[PDB]
């Protein structure tokens, strides 16, 4: 149950794409 929250996580690699991180100031 844990996991189907995080399969458009790990699968679709727009997460690490839509993470605050990079909304910041380079």
């Given at each position: ?11 679709a ?14």
């Open positions: 149950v844990s996991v189907d929250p995080f399969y458009e996580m790990l699968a690699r727009k997460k690490r794409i839509s993470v605050k991180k990079k909304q910041e100031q380079p």
